[PDB]
Amino acid sequence: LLLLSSIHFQCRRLDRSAHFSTLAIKQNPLLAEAYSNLGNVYKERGQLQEAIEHYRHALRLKPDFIDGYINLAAALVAAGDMEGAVQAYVSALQYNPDLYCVRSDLGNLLKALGRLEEAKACYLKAIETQPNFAVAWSNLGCVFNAQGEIWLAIHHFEKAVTLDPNFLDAYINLGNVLKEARIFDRAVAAYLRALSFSPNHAVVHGNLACVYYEQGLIDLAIDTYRRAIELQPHFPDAYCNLANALKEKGSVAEAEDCYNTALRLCPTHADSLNNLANIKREQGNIEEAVRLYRKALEVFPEFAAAHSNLASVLQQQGKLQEALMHYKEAIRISPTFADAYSN
């Protein structure tokens, strides 16, 4: 009568599973597992408060019921009771501290709540329990990464993929940290391994294209940016990034087309406004350059480059005092501009 509740649940025949669990409580209001089997039905229906109450009842009857604490934590996370779920996981680990998957889920919750040092401890203990548990190595990487510790982030992602060579998310995390560290040939390798498992991943294509650009492989960047657009076409940053690579190559006409595409999508795209103004400036259409830098500054008043570039075009027009104001505000915002000017 509880095995039949639990059998129907494995088949997701939830009406029949709830019927069989409700009968086991008409025939014994003290069996812990039947209130849990009922909670599991409510859980799959998205009736979370009902699931929680049934879980809590099962636990008031059998406080050593590990699965009650696990299922309860799930339901409290889904319902936004974050620290309740922390406590449910903590009790489960009191009763079986060898539950390394639980301990990693507990770590993930601790991470989400900004308690990076406790999360770290969870992951480390999970690893001490089960040293080959690649997820925990990867999660710990992500803690190190959020703490600015790039080397330790890399270390833990590489351990993650050595343990599990099919671990897509660990390759992506590894590529992203290598990209931040400017270790570009290793980043490329990690992105290309990710693409081996997920060939159409739009965000990885975007990051890989950026790594190629940082390397000075402009043609390869451009090809990768084009594919990134195909994969995710109606957002302006991907067009502005393509255009920046086109401009670097000297394909000015197509760069201008791409900037204009981004600006139909997003008329206040400040990078596109500035970078298109730069094409205008370089071609000698000073009036249109001025117009666009000024639009960029309306979107982003503290855009140092746009101030600098504006100042340059005003200086050419002989508007020397207005130029000077913008030179000075570029330096106020980003002082290294003064070292660029002097050079």
- Structural contact between residues 21 and 38, judged by C-beta atoms closer than 8 angstroms: yes
d(CA 97, CA 111): 20
Q: Please write down the long-range contacts of 25-30, taking CB distance under 8 Å and 24 or more positions apart.
A: 27/1, 30/61
Closest among 322, 329, 291 to 308, alpha carbons compared = 329
Token reading at 109 = 């919750």
Cα Rg, the chain, nearest whole Å: 28
CB 104 within 8 A of CB 136: yes
70-78 long-range contacts (CB < 8 A, ≥24 apart) are 70/102, 71/36, 71/39, 71/40, 71/43, 72/39, 73/105, 74/43, 75/39, 75/43, 75/48, 75/51, 76/52, 77/109, 78/43, 78/48
Look up the CATH superfamily of 1-343.
Tetratricopeptide repeat domain (1.25.40.10)
Among 76, 46, 77, smallest CA distance to 59 is for 76
The DSSP annotation for 173-216 comes to HHHHHHHHTT-HHHHHHHHHHHHHH-TT-HHHHHHHHHHHHHTT
Q: How many CB atoms lie within 10 A of CB 318?
A: 8
Long-range contacts of 185-191, Cβ-Cβ distance < 8 Å, separation of 24 or more: 185/215, 187/211, 188/212, 188/215
The rounded distance, in Å, linking the Cα atoms of 281 and 18 is 72
Which residue, among 339, 290, 297, has the nearest Cα to 316 in the 3D structure? 290
**Maximum Cα interatomic distance, the chain, rounded to a whole number of Å:** 94
Contact 145, 156 (CB under 8 A): no
Between CA 159 and CA 189 the distance in angstroms is 16
Three-state secondary structure call for residue 54: helix
Extract the tokens encoding 113. Answer: 């709540």
Residue type, 22: T
Whose CA is closest to 170, among 207, 125, 136?
136
Q: Residue holding tokens 């590990």?
A: 66
Q: What is the dihedral of CA 116, 120, 122, 124, to 10 degrees?
A: 180
Resolution (A): 1.8
HSE at residue 323, side-chain half, CA atoms within 13 A, is 11
Amino acid at 263: L
307 and 297 Cβ atoms separated by less than 8 Å:
yes
Cα gap 185→3, rounded to integer Å? 55
Mark out the alpha helices in 181-319 (DSSP H runs): 184-197, 202-214, 218-231, 236-249, 252-265, 270-283, 286-299, 304-316
As to burial, measured by CB atoms within 10 angstroms (0-12 exposed, 13-18 middle, 19+ buried), residue 117 is exposed
DSSP string, 125-192: HHHHH-TT-HHHHHHHHHHHHHTT-HHHHHHHHHHHHHH-TT-HHHHHHHHHHHHHTT-HHHHHHHHH
Quote the Cα angle for 287-288-294, to 5°.
Answer: 95
Sequence-ordered list of residues with C-beta below 8 angstroms from that of 335, at least 6 positions apart, any chain = none
Quote the distance between the C-alpha of residue 36 and its chain's center.
34
SS3 category, 341 = helix
Check: CB of residue 169 under 8 Å from CB of residue 190.
no
237/59 Cα distance (integer angstroms): 51
